[PDB]
Design a protein around this nucleic acid. Structure first.
Lengths: 169, 385, 203, 407, 53
RNA sequence: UGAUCCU
């Protein structure tokens, strides 16, 4: 706050008001930056499940290796997390702790999906289009920008009919 | 003693027939000087929830928190307003921690630490409930008592948790920090206020303050007398220096929502549709026992010094401006500053707090205080031990 | 009008007459035309020249200190000194001294607190003839621009030994040399030396 | 119904001119000021940690010094600016404390010099080859005083413009004289050092190489007392303030400070050092004694305490042979076996800057606070402390081991 | 020891009184060297006595 | 104040 002195610095050794270790580097915000989520708690709504993936992924790694329940339940985990598309691959088991990020589940968000498909120019313009009521996922026009869309639902996002932005393209 | 340049305002009856408490605030606003009469604000912001109030320790910035979404930091004396945040989570309290640049709000789940402009600085992973969010700048310690049994101390200088103390008392129904001692006072449903230091995992001393739950508690500037109210329509006048309730005001018409203490010795009791302040009620005699009605006008029996009744409200909390003679009462639609004659002190010490402070004076004083912070083990039952 | 026959240009704005920089006439101008990092002549501050015979160089110093800065020329000789007198009868920055700078306290009231000094003299006691100026007139952390003529100071010894000897003579006097230059194709076997009068924090 | 409020009046607290500084109304009511112990404690801890951060004793040396080793330093007792240094080669070098450079130097003695002393500037250089030479400061060798003893010492005397020599026998010379006036001996042995006190200047303290301390009286031409000590003694210093007590340095790592009325009980003992303490020098205040060891280290401590509040050491100095205190109580000159005479602070945080009265009153307040917050332990760990060298830390460990075996 | 001094000007002279002397030991020292750049530090030396134009 | 590491 002050560009404080050489004599001030050594006395205020451990203090900070901007980057804290309980504030965990403001890492969440950098994901709230890159994916433009409205509320903060959407991050911790993913990150409260994201450890819950690992909390099952860890203790299923603690079973004996050719336990015939263990390889079956892990396949049931991985086909589920591959249907929702939150990991790129499913062949390895190691993505269940390495690829399960908040950004990976957060790049399965709806404006990320439209932002990939280049219906929109930027990310936030797709959020503005969902807010304007221009988009639909198969049957239903969705109002919410924070839609978790699976891999198999990804073909169902179109523009909504009779709009002013579907005639724009 | 004669260097003291400014003297308190008074309120005098001038007759036995004329009465002190019967003055009303529009009637007060006639004779008070124009800036001081205009320092009474009427912020009716009826759209959001009931409003929580806190002035900073210098009166320079007001912070308010409506129950629904409002977070508002005005540079209160001038027209400037720093922060106006609409978080759709519900909030309970707020305080500036060091200066008006940094404050903290008590939400549904997590405490937030915030810039003057309204930006997000620090969401606390801990503080998972936050009912009372109070500060002591002499340790730079944000002490927070939620609905949990615990009590959390965050040292926002370093930005780290100091300690977390489970009371086994349940939901915190009141908390007032001691200015003179930095011992925290927590009030719970048994009628029990516990004194607290971050080191000692058992409380410093528990006090069976009243029956029923603790409505609120409020402490002197001198730390001598702390006025506690239960929900049993009762208010005790605790003398902390020897741990005695001096007077037990029993059978209020309604239990006071809050209590507040001015500098010069005023006591504020807010039953919620009514706000009533007594002068010199904290003294030793039961003649100084604060009482609602003295029959026959006896000087021994003590009448209230200043009265007010809110019509369409049940007010939330209240706090004096520490250097001026008003008190912000947060009602359901907003904020009134009710003008007292002699509540605040007339002669502040600038080297303790600056009510008239340049921003460059502010960044000098902030670094001055951060150099003079105490580490948390120095919170003790006596300052001088 | 030219001051010694150099060709000056002129531009127009909603007339500026810029005097061109002959590097052969002035070892300071050759020091600029050789390339420098950090030049102690400034568009506002006060500056002292030692060895300003006439305006072969010192008029350009009066230009580069401009309508703000002032140039204190130091010389002795009568006939180029008179040229400097009535050549200072047009520019207000210039003031020359006719005193021998072996005792710069003989003109000590005539300047107070100069910031930058330049050396152009041919004397063999060049470090001493600058050190008697910079110990009394120079601002703390104000720099010295030496112009060393090696054949005129000590000509019996080798080429670099003159400069390496005078730099240690300066380092004895809290004059740490920032950087060195020789300016060979403009003038053969010369030098200019940029340092700052340190006086506090020499190591 | 008298209605009266507080009015800040918006002009008293915020001044009219923009160039005017703020008005600062203070109320020293203790209710406004909550922490008179703890906040002052944190200010004191900040000051102590800052004085550990302001621990920069070194200034620089004098010139490039001797190549062979400083063995004796003379200080002109009027001249705060100038000083003299004698080498065991024989080169005398004179310095000015402003310039820190050689004012004048001379090939005095082809033998060693053992002492330099100053009395009418005028310097006097005592030899190993039976010669003292008189030099003047702006040229050289006014007169040489030849004595029968190899000169184990010298000391100056201000009154009657006198100087005695220390040797096998001490014999008092004058300026005009080439032969001495009177020669004294309590015991028939070589004398290591001599010192006249400065006030009531006629008294002398004479160490004795066979473990002796004699107090010589010029007024009687006879010693007046002698205590035969345990071990031999290196050097001496009379305090300029008290003028009737003196500290001497002993062959064991201990300096003893004695009283002219009572030598049978010392005034004090000091043993922070780990080797034979060479030289002692006393403050013009009379506050602190600074003493340099045969060990590569000097130490400053006050008279009443008895333990080293300050210790001085670095890489390139060893076996220092000599330490000479200020005239102005501010800087100690430090001779070397390594030949180079370094300029060192009396206190490494005390600075030469004449101070602005904001910070000067603050600094006086802070050190007043440092004393009333002294003996608290967390203050004590920063207040004692600074780096000590490896062998000397081991040597103090060795001394504590041996004294623990003794008791 | 330096109590008085003479500063010399084109408009007459200047007689100064030196109230607090800097130490002539630390005269190469950075502390008094930085102090001569601070008028807040320079003022503690000198009192203005005379200006005889 | 202190205590680690590599030839």
């Amino acid at each position: 706050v002050r560009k404080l002195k050489h004599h001030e610095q050594k006395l205020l050794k451990k203090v900070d008001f901007l980057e804290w270790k309980q504030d965990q580097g403001h890492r969440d915000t950098q994901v709230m930056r890159t994916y433009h989520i409205q509320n903060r708690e959407d991050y911790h709504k993913y990150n409260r499940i994201c450890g819950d993936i690992r909390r099952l992924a860890n203790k299923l790694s603690l079973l004996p290796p050719t336990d015939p329940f263990r390889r079956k339940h892990e396949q049931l985990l991985l086909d589920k997390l591959y249907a929702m598309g939150v990991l790129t691959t499913k062949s390895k088991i190691s993505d269940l702790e390495n690829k399960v990020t908040v950004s990976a589940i957060c790049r399965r968000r709806l404006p990320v999906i439209m932002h990939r498909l280049k219906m929109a120019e930027t990310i936030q313009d797709a959020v503005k289009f969902i807010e304007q009521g221009h988009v639909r996922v198969g049957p239903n026009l969705i109002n919410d920008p924070a839609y978790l869309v699976t891999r198999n639902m990804e073909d169902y996002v179109t523009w909504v009919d009779n709009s002013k932005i579907k005639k724009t393209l | 003693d004669y260097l003291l340049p400014e003297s308190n305002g008074y309120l005098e009856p001038e007759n036995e027939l004329e009465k002190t408490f019967k003055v009303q605030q529009s009637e007060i606003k006639s004779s008070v000087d124009v800036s001081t009469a205009n320092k009474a604000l009427d912020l009716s912001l009826k759209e959001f929830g009931p409003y929580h109030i806190k002035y900073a320790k210098n009166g320079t910035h007001l912070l308010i928190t409506g129950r629904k979404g409002h977070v508002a930091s005005m540079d209160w004396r001038k027209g400037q307003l720093r922060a106006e945040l609409f978080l759709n989570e519900t909030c309970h309290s707020a305080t500036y921690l060091q200066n008006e640049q940094y404050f903290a709000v008590a939400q549904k789940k997590y405490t937030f630490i915030y810039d003057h402009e309204g930006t997000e600085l620090h969401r606390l992973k801990q503080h998972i409930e936050a009912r009372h969010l109070d500060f002591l700048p002499y340790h730079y310690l944000l002490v927070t008592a939620g609905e949990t049994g615990w009590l959390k101390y965050h040292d926002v200088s370093t930005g780290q948790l100091v300690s977390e103390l489970r009371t086994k008392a349940g939901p915190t129904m009141a908390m007032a920090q001691n200015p003179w001692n930095a011992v925290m006072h927590l009030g719970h449903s048994n009628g029990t206020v516990s004194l607290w230091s971050p080191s000692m995992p058992e409380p410093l001393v528990k006090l069976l303050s009243a029956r029923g739950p603790v409505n609120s508690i409020a402490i002197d500037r001198s730390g001598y007398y702390m006025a506690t109210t239960g929900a049993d329509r009762s208010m005790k006048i605790w003398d902390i220096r020897n741990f005695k309730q001096l007077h037990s005001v029993e059978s209020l018409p309604t239990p006071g929502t809050n209590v507040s203490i001015s500098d010069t010795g005023l006591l504020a009791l807010s039953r919620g549709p009514h706000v009533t302040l007594w002068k010199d009620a904290l003294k030793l005699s039961g003649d100084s026992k604060p009482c609602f009605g003295s029959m026959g006008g006896n000087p021994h029996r003590n009448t209230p010094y200043m009265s007010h009744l809110f019509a369409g409200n049940k007010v939330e909390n209240l706090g004096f401006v520490p250097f001026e003679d008003l008190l912000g009462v947060g009602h359901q639609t907003g904020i009134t500053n009710l003008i007292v004659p002699g509540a605040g002190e007339a002669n502040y010490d600038a080297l303790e707090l600056n009510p008239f402070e340049t921003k460059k004076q502010r960044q000098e004083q902030e670094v001055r205080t951060l150099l003079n912070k105490l580490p948390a083990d120095t919170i003790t039952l006596d300052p001088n031990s | 009008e030219s001051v010694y026959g150099e060709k000056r240009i002129s531009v127009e704005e909603p007339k500026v007459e810029y005097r061109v920089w002959n590097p052969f006439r002035s070892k300071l101008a050759a020091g600029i035309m050789g390339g420098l990092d950090e030049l102690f002549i400034a568009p506002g501050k006060k500056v002292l020249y030692l060895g300003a015979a006439s305006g072969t160089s010192v008029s350009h110093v009066s230009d580069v200190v401009g309508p703000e800065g002032v140039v204190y020329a130091v010389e002795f000789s009568h006939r180029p000194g008179r040229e400097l007198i009535s050549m200072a009868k047009k520019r207000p920055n210039i003031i020359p001294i006719i005193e021998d700078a072996r005792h710069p306290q003989k003109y000590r009231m005539l300047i107070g607190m100069v910031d930058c000094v330049f050396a152009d003299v041919a004397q063999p006691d060049q470090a001493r003839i600058i050190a008697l100026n910079s110990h009394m007139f120079l601002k703390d952390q104000g720099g010295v621009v030496i112009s060393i003529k090696a054949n005129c100071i000590d000509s019996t010894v080798d080429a670099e030994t003159v400069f390496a000897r005078e730099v240690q003579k300066l380092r004895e006097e809290r004059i740490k040399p920032l950087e060195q230059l020789t300016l060979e194709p403009y003038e053969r076997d010369h030098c200019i030396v940029v340092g700052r009068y340190m006086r506090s924090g020499l190591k | 119904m008298k209605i009266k409020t507080i009015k800040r009046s918006a002009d008293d607290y915020v001044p009219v001119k923009s160039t005017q500084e703020s008005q600062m109304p203070r109320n020293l009511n203790p209710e406004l000021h909550p922490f008179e112990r703890a906040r002052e404690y944190t200010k004191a801890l900040n000051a102590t940690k800052l004085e550990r951060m302001f621990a920069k004793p070194f200034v620089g040396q004098l010139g490039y010094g001797h190549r062979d080793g400083v063995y004796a330093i003379a200080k002109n007792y009027g001249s705060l600016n100038k000083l003299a240094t004698g080498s065991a080669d024989g080169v005398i070098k004179y310095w000015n404390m402003s310039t820190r450079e050689e004012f004048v130097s001379f090939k005095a003695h082809y033998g060693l010099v053992t002492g330099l002393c100053v009395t009418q500037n005028f310097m006097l250089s005592c030899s190993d080859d039976k010669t003292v030479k008189l030099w003047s400061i702006n040229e050289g060798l006014i007169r040489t005083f030849d004595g029968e003893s190899a000169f184990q010492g010298i000391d100056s005397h201000r009154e009657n413009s006198t100087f005695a020599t220390g040797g096998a026998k001490i014999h008092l010379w004058d300026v005009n004289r080439l032969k001495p006036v009177s020669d004294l001996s309590w015991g028939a042995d070589n004398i290591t050092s001599l010192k006249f006190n400065q006030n009531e200047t006629d008294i002398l303290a004479s160490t004795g190489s066979d473990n002796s301390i004699v107090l010589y009286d010029l007024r009687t031409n006879s010693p007046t007392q002698k205590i035969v000590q345990t071990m031999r003694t290196n050097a001496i210093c009379w305090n300029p303030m008290e003028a009737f007590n003196f500290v001497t340095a002993n062959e064991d790592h201990n300096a003893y400070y004695y009283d002219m009325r009572n030598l049978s009980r010392s005034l004090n003992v000091f043993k922070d050092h780990v080797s034979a303490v060479m030289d002692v020098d006393f403050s013009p205040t009379g506050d602190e004694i600074v003493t340099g060891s045969y060990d590569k280290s000097i130490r400053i401590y006050k008279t009443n305490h008895g333990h080293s509040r300050e210790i001085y050491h670095t890489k390139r100095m060893q076996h220092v042979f000599q330490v000479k205190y200020s005239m102005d109580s501010k800087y100690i000159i430090s001779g070397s076996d390594d030949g180079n005479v370094r300029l060192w602070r009396s206190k490494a945080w005390e600075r030469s800057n004449v101070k602005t009265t904001r910070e000067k009153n603050k600094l006086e307040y802070d050190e007043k606070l440092k004393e009333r917050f002294r003996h608290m332990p967390e203050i004590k760990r920063i207040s004692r402390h600074r780096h000590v060298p490896q062998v000397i830390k081991k040597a103090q460990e060795i001394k504590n081991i041996e004294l623990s075996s003794i008791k | 020891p330096i109590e008085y001094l003479l500063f010399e000007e084109p408009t007459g002279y200047a007689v100064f009184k030196v109230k607090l002397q800097q130490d002539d030991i630390g005269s190469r020292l950075k502390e008094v060297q930085e102090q001569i750049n601070d008028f807040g530090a320079f003022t503690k030396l000198i009192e203005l006595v005379s200006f005889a134009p």
